């Protein structure tokens, strides 16, 4: 009656028999759709059928992707966009208007922060940052203006978690809509809608695709809210249309999601256990260490601690630089959730422009490096981090 | 001499690419990669500071997109190009970038439906002031200018009546008062009309249409000055829109552009013959094609466009009624909305797009009850004449 996650990630919403027996669904790389009669055309520009009209909407390969993602997240409806920024700008452009306020997690993915403060925030929308695990600080931050609560969990830099059920309880008192960016965990590890959130966004560019070869975004949620985001945010405000080709490749990626995430976590579990014992290392942030400040809440929301690790080297910027340069298997790159392991050191990379004090107000430590642990053999990954730690001294 | 600009077809095929820089690959390899890596954290640092040239992350820059961009720039005669997920991606990333609350944008009298919706229900609801003016009436435009006027935005020819504006005249007014001129050049492509060479600051394209030519991708393009395109790339696209073009689709777009001059020659030659034939048919009350002397702006068309395009609009004798009959009788033209495909398209807004209404109405927007729009494609002209001939008879 109710098939497993792995079954649904492979099968949900598709029966080969409905499409000439094709085991893999054919790709609708088409811009436009045609009508058998003008009477048939007339029905599409109001709505009654659930058919197809124009690939900026109603494409069957996008439709399948959306249904499958909605199934996995446990939500009513899905929407596929050209990037994770597309998913979030479409969502927020449709939910907010001048004078509305959005409450934010204290830290956010860089471009998201840029969107809020330098984009929509410059159009009369109000922004407040608050710690989304501190339920009393949140209740006290609610105002009649508050219309959206938006955060990632876990969040860069320190993998800080939100209490999603608690946020939802507070939001429901004020009618506010809770949006969670679930990029890090994926629906395999965490399902925020089952915990009370109204909408989830994904940069499918990362773990969902898993292979570093597409940019894509996903939104899942209630049908009324998803419809408006499709018909307003996507169609009119953004034009962040997902290629059917990239959509097909994303679905191909999703068929191994459970497998890849088990391995991302198992690899990160050993590296974290290793890193936590090293002398070059003052601090580690990894949800599956007993020492993780929100260890308990982590275990309540996530079925596994994930593939990302953040840590701080004794020795600041110079140690970070030395560590990064010596790496031979990990690549120096931004991004995460690929088969290949990646590392970044923000103080010398993404945030090298500013100086020691400005990086502090953002919680970006001078020695902070972040690993996206991939799928390579751990012995190889271990050796690589080891010699790099040796080089950092 | 060698300071001579290569021809348009030469540039559409070769501009910005030399096989010898990629191991002799005749066709550029497709950079289907979300991210790029760094040799050191210094070379990586230098690429968030503006010292070194290179690649951050495919949402901001990518070699396949870059070549498409430089090539579209060359063709429009602009400094810099930007490739996006759709035409609306191009339009929204440009407008979100250039406009803030308190600013006014002056708009052509009619627009593409989603552009109109974007303006009125989107950015217009965020404190941006909108005013429509007839961009053909240079005196009215000049009179509408205020110190708040920040952008002037229009299509030429415009959806849906093929109304034209004097691009050079609009540019002259804009330079005296200080507004940025953005022109949607979808209908013409740079092969037929180059608004930037006429003084526009920016042009936008739905490359989904003629640039692609084969109706298999969605894409948008912006061309203009290096400074404006950089700003749009770094604010509109990257933060405000996320309308990222797939490198696969961008390769396909470049493949389309290699035949643009050839396809457009044929769209125009076909539409010219169709239009003259339709002008002479008993059932046709009215016809708009820029290649006919009866086109209200015949003279502006022939001054701005090297050829008159592949779109025809025409009214049938009879009403709503006669459209349905004509449309439903077509066997070769497809009933569809869109344009610039290899295949011929027809739409009868009365019984299709705008069917939610009544005989009254649409007048608000100014649309006839026997009005049909054709996107003339690349099929044999005799088969296209035969299809509309047999369908006109059915419409009686």
Curated annotation (Swiss-Prot), chain A:
Modified residues (N6-(pyridoxal phosphate)lysine): 206
Residues annotated for pyridoxal 5'-phosphate binding in this entry: 54-56, 84-85, 203-205
A UniProt-annotated Pfam family: Cys_Met_Meta_PP
InterPro entries for the chain: Cys/Met-Metab_PyrdxlP-dep_enz, Cys_met_metab_PP, L-Met_gamma_lys, PyrdxlP-dep_Trfase, PyrdxlP-dep_Trfase_major, PyrdxlP-dep_Trfase_small
Modes of activity regulation: Irreversibly inactivated by DL-propargylglycine.
Catalytic function, reaction form: L-methionine + H2O = methanethiol + 2-oxobutanoate + NH4(+); L-homocysteine + H2O = 2-oxobutanoate + hydrogen sulfide + NH4(+) + H(+)
GO (cellular component) term, any one: cytoplasm
Record GO biological process: transsulfuration
Keywords: Lyase, Pyridoxal phosphate
Its EC number(s): 4.4.1.11, 4.4.1.2
Top-level lineage group: Bacteria
SUPFAM superfamilies in alphabetical order: PLP-dependent transferases (SSF53383)
Primary enzyme class: lyase
GO MF terms, alphabetically ordered: homocysteine desulfhydrase activity; methionine gamma-lyase activity; pyridoxal phosphate binding
Induction notes from the record: Is under the control of the positive transcriptional regulator MdeR. Forms part of an operon with mdeB.
Cofactor(s) this protein requires: pyridoxal 5'-phosphate
Binding residues annotated for substrate, in chain numbering: 109, 370
Assembly and oligomerization: Homotetramer; dimer of active dimers.
NCBIfam families: met_gam_lyase, PRK07503.1
Family indicated by similarity: Belongs to the trans-sulfuration enzymes family. L-methionine gamma-lyase subfamily.
Functional description taken from the UniProt entry: Catalyzes the alpha,gamma-elimination of L-methionine to produce methanethiol, 2-oxobutanoate and ammonia. Is involved in L-methionine catabolism. In fact, shows a multicatalytic function since it also catalyzes gamma-replacement of L-methionine with thiol compounds, alpha,gamma-elimination and gamma-replacement reactions of L-homocysteine and its S-substituted derivatives, O-substituted-L-homoserines and DL-selenomethionine, and, to a lesser extent, alpha,beta-elimination and beta-replacement reactions of L-cysteine, S-methyl-L-cysteine, and O-acetyl-L-serine.
Protein name: L-methionine gamma-lyase
Organism: Pseudomonas putida
């Amino acid at each position: 009656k109710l098939p497993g996650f792995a079954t649904r990630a492979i099968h949900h919403g598709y029966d080969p028999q409905d499409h000439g027996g094709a085991l893999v669904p054919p790709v609708y790389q088409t811009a436009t759709f045609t009508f058998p009669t003008v009477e048939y055309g007339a029905a599409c520009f109001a709505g009654e059928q659930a058919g197809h009209f124009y690939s900026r909407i109603s494409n069957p390969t996008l439709n399948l992707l959306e249904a499958r993602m909605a199934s996995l997240e446990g939500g009513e409806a899905g929407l596929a966009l050209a990037s994770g920024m597309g998913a979030i700008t479409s969502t927020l452009w449709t939910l907010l208007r001048p004078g509305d306020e959005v409450l934010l997690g204290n830290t956010l993915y860089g471009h998201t922060f840029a969107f809020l403060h330098h984009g929509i925030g410059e159009f009369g929308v109000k922004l407040r940052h608050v710690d989304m695990a501190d339920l009393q600080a949140l209740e006290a931050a609610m105002t009649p203006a508050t219309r959206v609560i938006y955060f990632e969990s876990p969040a860069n830099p320190n993998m800080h978690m939100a209490d999603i059920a608690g946020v939802a309880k507070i939001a429901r008192k004020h009618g506010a809509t809770v949006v969670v960016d679930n990029t890090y965990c994926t629906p395999y590890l965490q399902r925020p809608l089952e915990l009370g959130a109204d909408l989830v966004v994904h940069s499918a560019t990362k773990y969902l695709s898993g292979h570093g070869d597409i940019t894509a975004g996903i939104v899942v949620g209630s049908q009324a809210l998803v419809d408006r985001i499709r018909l307003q945010g996507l169609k009119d405000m953004t034009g962040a249309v997902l290629s059917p080709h990239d959509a097909a490749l994303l679905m191909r990626g999703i068929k191994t999601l459970n497998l890849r995430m088990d391995r991302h976590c198992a690899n990160a579990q050993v590296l974290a256990e290793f890193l936590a014992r090293q002398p070059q290392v003052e601090l580690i942030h990894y949800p599956g260490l007993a020492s993780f400040p929100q260890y308990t809440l982590a275990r309540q929301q996530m079925s596994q601690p994930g593939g990302m690790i953040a840590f701080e080297l004794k020795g600041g910027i110079g140690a970070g630089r030395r560590f990064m340069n010596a790496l031979q298997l990990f690549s120096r790159a931004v991004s995460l959730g690929d088969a290949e392991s990646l590392a970044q050191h923000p103080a010398s990379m993404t945030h090298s422009s500013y100086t020691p004090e400005e990086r502090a107000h953002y919680g970006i430590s001078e020695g902070l490096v972040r690993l996206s642990v991939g799928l390579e053999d751990i012995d190889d990954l271990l050796a690589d981090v080891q010699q790099a730690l040796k080089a950092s001294a």
